Ligand binder design. Structure first.
Ligand SMILES: NCCc1ccc(S(=O)(=O)F)cc1
Length: 164
């Protein structure tokens, strides 16, 4: 029962594409495996993803974030087309991870960009993510309980020097 237009992908086709794309662009497959179930609806034979409204596809991108990646030179279709597609959305998730990793490491020198921190950056955007890490307050607080748990864990990991 889920706590309260779609496209459906099978687990196999998502897995195959993740395996291929993650290898090609140097983003861990485990990050995709972490993020996809948080952002989308898990069903028996795969995942369903919302492709209407402001946030769309497996990465739940908005147009501004998607276009930000294109501005960096990433080869993506237009937001409205790519966000409904398997491969383009997976590339975008990964490209965004790579850019957010750079942003995190530049502001918090000597710190490690973990999956939950990467998800926080994905969820809030890099500016607001850094603001949450410093202030403890989300700029965009209207998130799911799973998203909130993930970003809380992210801040915990950020602050603490080591596993413990
Ligand atoms: N996942 C992106 C998080 C995000 C990024 C930007 C905004 S907005 O201020 O431009 F409406 C809102 C939410």
């Amino acid at each position: 029962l889920q706590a309260l237009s779609r496209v459906r992908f099978t687990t196999a086709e998502v897995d195959s594409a993740v395996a291929r794309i993650s290898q090609k662009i140097g983003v861990p497959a485990s990050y995709y495996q972490f993020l996809i179930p948080i952002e989308n609806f898990v069903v028996a034979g795969g995942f369903e993803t919302t492709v209407s409204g402001s946030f769309r596809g497996l990465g739940q991108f908005n147009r501004q974030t998607w276009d930000g990646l294109r501005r960096l030179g990433r080869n993506l279709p237009a937001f409205e087309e790519g966000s409904a597609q398997l491969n383009a959305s997976l590339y975008a998730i990964g490209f965004l991870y790579l850019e957010n990793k750079r942003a995190y490491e530049a502001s918090f020198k000597g710190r490690v960009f973990t999956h939950e921190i990467a998800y926080l950056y994905h969820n809030q955007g890099a500016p607001a993510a850094e603001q949450y890490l410093t202030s403890g307050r989300l700029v965009y607080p209207k998130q799911s309980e799973a998203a909130v748990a993930a970003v809380a864990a992210a801040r915990n990991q950020h602050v603490k020097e080591s596993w413990a």
